[PDB]
Design a protein around this ligand. Structure first.
Ligand SMILES: Nc1nc2c(ncn2[C@@H]2O[C@H](COP(=O)(O)CP(=O)(O)OP(=O)(O)O)[C@@H](O)[C@H]2O)c(=O)[nH]1
Ligand SMILES: Nc1nc2c(ncn2[C@@H]2O[C@H](COP(=O)(O)OP(=O)(O)OP(=O)(O)O)[C@@H](O)[C@H]2O)c(=O)[nH]1
Ligand SMILES: Nc1nc2c(ncn2[C@@H]2O[C@H](COP(=O)(O)OP(=O)(O)OP(=O)(O)O)[C@@H](O)[C@H]2O)c(=O)[nH]1
Ligand SMILES: [Mg+2]
Ligand SMILES: [Mg+2]
Ligand SMILES: [Mg+2]
Lengths: 423, 429, 423
């Protein structure tokens, strides 16, 4: 009766969704053919025959990666009216994804939403797997979110996004993407989510015993996070926290909606022993700086709000002693005027494995993330100091002052976390 | 006669009633189906007060189950004692309150309230004589905060003489399971101080303590967390459902205890409590049941009676027992803790003796306490309110529902009006 | 006891009838030899031996396409006194079909009607499959309909016709056909039916996964429509709507008799899954502009009356909620002074397949069709502004002012829908 649809924008989001719906089919026992040999209306719908289809929309301006789903192993799962392709990519040009090509096939993707919104009645959240690296994953992202608040307005819109890395950075105009996309995702998204590529590597290198990771394995870490956020809807625990509450819990002021995800425990197969993984053991590893997936030191700021989504085998009194430890420390410290800073969620379902006992997803809306914007503002100034690459965005119809209008917009964003940090 | 209509709300309070009606099932020999299997004919003599005897050897729980999402209603009907209820009475919404008081009281509270107030009317018409209404919910969630408090003001508009008791859990002192637990307390404080006749107040942390201090448990489940309140609620009306050497009911407990209508916020107490094997190495008699009550640790609300002053004391016993073994114990303990009480009441110990024990041990006692220790918890809660209010955070949700600061401020002032009055009689002696 | 004969005029109507009676034999289990290994008197009659013959008359002025039936696979089905051929075609000349050649063999075809009208007693409608493209399908059409209202007058006369396309137009004097034929089919036909070729292509291209259709496949779409209009006579549903009611329901004023057909759901074989096709799902696809078979946008006017002919597996309360949605929308809107604008018909017979569960035929007498006449009036003016091709119609005995008499006749036709559109 309760639903939560998903949209995938750009090439980086599709390869996230290739591992996500790989995991969801293994959750409810679904085959790649939509077949299984109760309450799962959030991510699936039933046909007239005994087949289930995903509530997913795959958009791309280049026809490459969607053919990898249209010819891959997960081929028969998807409705061919969902698989939407373009012809010419934005090709790491935000003005092409926002003005040139994305304005043409915008009619088809938005029409597929209401075709999914017929059978949905408990519409409780949206999923937009979009990166800020590629132009298609960013230029279409701004055009998509404008119509939905015109469409729904009151319904929830969540973005499990990918943060551009401060050191290991692939493309060139990746600093140009973030400042331009700021005005959309601060005025439409109810709670955006930042994940950096860079912190994943040492988690793969040290904690997962494989120094040289693959992008197939980078998606496996985030796919476990997205499932355990939905662990209250898809199942039944003693304390089920639905997605309406998170945007009401984690948001003290309606502009501040940038937490970070933290999955724990992250172990290897050989290190599955030499440990016991009690509920007090693993939550201290959550607040370890080298276990999070965002390159931000949590002891460089203060926590505004914290959330903990447990699964597996959990007794709350045993967690009650675990939370009592973290308030009674000193290197871990909160925003002082928020003394009630925990949101606990327990599900009695084990964390499934993709080819352990319990697992924790930590969601901490903190002030440690605010330094990451300043590391990216420093990138954007010098490339705009030369007026470099202006003839591509202006070459694809964009105002020069639209950079400058969004330039001060980050300063009003940055002064928020600075103001909340002091008493 | 004098039948009682049961209303639930929230998500915590439903699972308590999911255990509480199991307690009433074996306190009346009621099977999980709905038929009867008891042997003692004292059950059938007053069976009507918590059960409608339906047609054809049936008994249904006179209870109104209320939620705002179909999950918890599914969990009750699938597990134990779910088919015993009437499927007509599973009256529940589809949205979920979102852990907002204003969603449970203004927007989504107005929807399902009409479906409930006919069911309240259908049971109150069907009852021969009506005694009072009881409510089990939360003060931390959304559905337990707004939806239950919206009902009681409509019921006080209906019935002036009928009593009302809420077994509402106090928001937690130190652990913070709810992020907005002041915003679910303070907006719920104002409804409770106006038109609730007596109000039960249970801290979370002491319930963890009593399950750990006396019993010494390792993995306490909510089937054993919330079970202590289920025996507690049964001990309130256990003199109603069966005869005694000194009977009692919900009106006798009200007028004896509450000295002024703004001071009616009570604390429980239960005895005896053992371990699984450490149960025989103790003289489990009346003086052991005497001194097990009056200590600080037995209170399910975490408060020190040493840091406060009592006003009145009720005590409900169960099982056959003598009297001077009780009465001198119920007299002398006022003299050893002499300065802890207040001056202006002679013999503030109300005694109640039923003649039916629990299904189990031979004798049992239920303590109902009233003291000035609870107001010191609210000064923390008023601090927890103002800490999230001196920056005026979390307002745009309630602004999105529509509410001025004065409704927050006067309820905080009315919370301070509770502060100004439990301190007033405490300062007096 | 109830009958409905059929007439096929011109070459385009014969190839429609080649697929129609292909379908009817597959309905009642009839072989091509008129053989089957109850109540079907509407389209068939029984011989003395166990053979059934179609109630069809095939007229043509050229002997080509009738030999394709006289030598084809469906050869033994037809009475050779029904198969009527000419010698010289009208050859895309309306004045030849109306004056020159069609005046000679008019005696034979009209005589075959009363030979069929002997065994008919519940005569409830006529079927004239005539196109407006060819001269034989239009010139004979005017001469045929004049005698029948002299013959019967009170009996029903229906025309499942083919509308000439505004862009993909084959012949040259196709604008000359429509203005000349207007005075006949507005003064004889009880309810004419327009179907454009152009909207069929994208239905074949997108919805049927074959970008390059064949005329054998174009006839398959209309043949499903003609069957489900007769789904109440040939079978038994809980709400059988007979052909006397449609001309009384769909006609508010006796000149306005131009609805449009809409078959739905139109799916492919591979897209038979990834769907469930509930009765509320498919009726929204009926009012989709790209699913109809007439190139007219339905959101450019208002609906005067609507009809819905269901078959397969249908519960009316489930349709009752579906119709309640369409009145409670805004982009779909009616003529306001007609608040009772639905005609529902349910048959408990599945839509048969020609080499699914349910099917919908939608008949919507609307004001969106009135722009199609103005697109064809714009074609007819300029070709008459030069006085082009006057020496063929006058070369075959026609008044010049007979164009001009029919010229203002379209203006009186066009001002009807404009007048009904306002309140
Ligand atoms: N002693 C118990 N406390 C509980 C239990 N479940 C929840 N809680 C407490 O109750 C509070 C949450 O309230 P609820 O469980 O009633 C949530 P509710 O349906 O009322 O509203 P929503 O937030 O809209 O879901 C919070 O303080 C929890 O710590 C339980 O089984 N026992
Ligand atoms: N999360 C995630 N990010 C990836 C992966 N592979 C590449 N990326 C990042 O995705 C960004 C590139 O975005 P893409 O989605 O591939 O490009 P696009 O949006 O389709 O736009 P164009 O390809 O420029 O037309 C870079 O920052 C890459 O580091 C992956 O497997 N997972
Ligand atoms: N519905 C339909 N129309 C067709 C088909 N093939 C051609 N047409 C159309 O039919 C029209 C031509 O009419 P015809 O019936 O072939 O010609 P006619 O009436 O016999 O007259 P002449 O051939 O000129 O002597 C054109 O508009 C064609 O586009 C077909 O398979 N189905
Ligand atoms: Mg790409
Ligand atoms: Mg709840
Ligand atoms: Mg021809």
């Amino acid at each position: 009766m309760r639903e939560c649809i998903s949209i995938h924008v750009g090439q980086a989001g599709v390869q996230i969704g290739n591992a996500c719906w790989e995991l969801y089919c293994l959750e409810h026992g679904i085959q790649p053919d939509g077949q299984m040999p109760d309450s799962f209306n959030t991510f699936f719908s039933e046909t007239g025959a005994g087949k289930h289809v995903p509530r997913a929309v795959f958009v791309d301006l280049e026809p490459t990666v969607i053919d990898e789903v249209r010819t891959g192993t997960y081929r028969q799962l998807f409705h061919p009216e969902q698989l939407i392709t373009g012809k010419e990519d934005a090709a790491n040009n935000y003005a092409r994804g926002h003005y040139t090509i994305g304005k043409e096939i915008i009619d088809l993707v938005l029409d597929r939403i209401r075709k999914l919104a017929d059978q949905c009645t408990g519409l409780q959240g949206f999923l937009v797997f979009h990166s800020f690296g590629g132009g298609t994953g960013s230029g279409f992202t701004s055009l998509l979110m404008e119509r939905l608040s015109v469409d729904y307005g009151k319904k929830s819109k969540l973005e499990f996004s990918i943060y551009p890395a401060p050191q290991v950075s692939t493309a060139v105009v990746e600093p140009y993407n973030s400042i331009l996309t700021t005005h959309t995702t601060l005025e439409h998204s109810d709670c955006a989510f930042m994940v950096d590529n860079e912190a994943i590597y040492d988690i793969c290198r040290r904690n997962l015993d494989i120094e040289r990771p693959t992008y197939t394995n980078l998606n496996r870490l985030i796919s476990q996070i997205v499932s355990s956020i939905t662990a209250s809807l898809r199942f039944d625990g003693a304390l089920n926290v639905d997605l309406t509450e998170f945007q009401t819990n984690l948001v003290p002021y309606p502009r501040i909606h940038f937490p970070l995800a933290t999955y724990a425990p992250v172990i290897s197969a050989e290190k599955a022993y030499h440990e016991q993984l009690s509920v007090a053991e693993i939550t201290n590893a959550c607040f370890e700086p080298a276990n999070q997936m965002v390159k931000c030191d949590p002891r460089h700021g203060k926590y505004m709000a914290c959330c903990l989504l447990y699964r597996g085998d959990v007794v709350p009194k045993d967690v009650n002693a675990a939370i009592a430890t973290i308030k009674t420390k000193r290197s871990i410290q909160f925003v002082d005027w928020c003394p009630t800073g925990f949101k606990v969620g327990i599900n009695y379902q084990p964390p499934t494995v993709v080819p352990v006992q319990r697992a924790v997803c930590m969601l901490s809306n903190t002030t440690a993330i605010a330094e990451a914007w300043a590391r990216l503002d420093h990138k954007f100034d010098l490339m705009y100091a030369k007026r470099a690459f202006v003839h591509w965005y202006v070459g694809e119809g964009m105002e020069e002052g639209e950079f400058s209008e969004a330039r001060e917009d980050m300063a009003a964003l940055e002064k928020d976390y600075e103001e909340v940090g002091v008493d | 006669m004098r039948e009682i209509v049961h209303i639930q709300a929230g998500q915590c309070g439903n699972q308590i009633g999911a255990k509480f009606w199991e307690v009433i099932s074996d306190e009346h020999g009621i099977d999980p189906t709905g038929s009867y299997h008891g042997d003692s004919d004292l059950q059938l003599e007053r069976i009507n007060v918590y059960y409608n005897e339906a047609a054809g050897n049936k008994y249904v729980p006179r209870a109104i189950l209320v939620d705002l999402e179909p999950g918890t209603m599914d969990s009750v009907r699938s597990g134990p004692f779910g088919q015993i209820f009437r499927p007509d009475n599973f009256v529940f919404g589809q949205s979920g309150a979102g852990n907002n008081w204003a969603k449970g009281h203004y927007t989504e509270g107005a929807e399902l309230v009409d479906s409930v107030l006919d069911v309240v009317r259908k049971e109150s018409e069907s009852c021969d004589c009506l005694q009072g209404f009881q409510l089990t919910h939360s003060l931390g969630g959304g559905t337990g905060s707004g939806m239950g408090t919206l009902l009681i003001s409509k019921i006080r508009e209906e019935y002036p003489d009928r009593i009302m008791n809420t077994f509402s859990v106090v928001p937690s002192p130190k652990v913070s399971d709810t992020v907005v637990e002041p915003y679910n307390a303070t907006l719920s404080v104002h409804q409770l101080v106006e038109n609730t006749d007596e109000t039960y107040c249970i801290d979370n942390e002491a319930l963890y303590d009593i399950c750990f201090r006396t019993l010494k448990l390792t993995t306490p489940t909510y089937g054993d967390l919330n079970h202590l309140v289920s025996a507690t609620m049964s001990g309130v009306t256990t003199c109603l459902r069966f005869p005694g050497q000194l009977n009692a009911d919900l009106r006798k407990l009200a007028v004896n205890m509450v000295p002024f209508p703004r001071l009616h916020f009570f604390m429980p107490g239960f005895a005896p409590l053992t371990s699984r094997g450490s149960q025989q190495y103790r003289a489990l008699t009346v003086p052991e049941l005497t001194q097990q009550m009056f200590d600080a640790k037995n209170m399910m609300a975490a408060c020190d009676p040493r840091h406060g002053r009592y006003l009145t004391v009720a005590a409900v016993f169960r099982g056959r027992m003598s009297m001077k073994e009780v009465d001198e114990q119920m007299l002398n303990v006022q003299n050893k803790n002499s300065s802890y009480f207040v001056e202006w009441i002679p013999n503030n110990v109300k005694t109640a003796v039923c003649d039916i024990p629990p299904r189990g041990l031979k004798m049992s006692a239920t303590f109902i306490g009233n003291s000035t220790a609870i107001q010191e918890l609210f000064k923390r809660i008023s601090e927890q309110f103002t800490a999230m209010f001196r920056r005026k955070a979390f307002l745009h949700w309630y602004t999105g529902e529509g509410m001025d600061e004065m409704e927050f401020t006067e309820a905080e002032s009315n919370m301070n009006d509770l502060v100004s009055e439990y301190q007033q009689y405490q300062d007096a002696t």
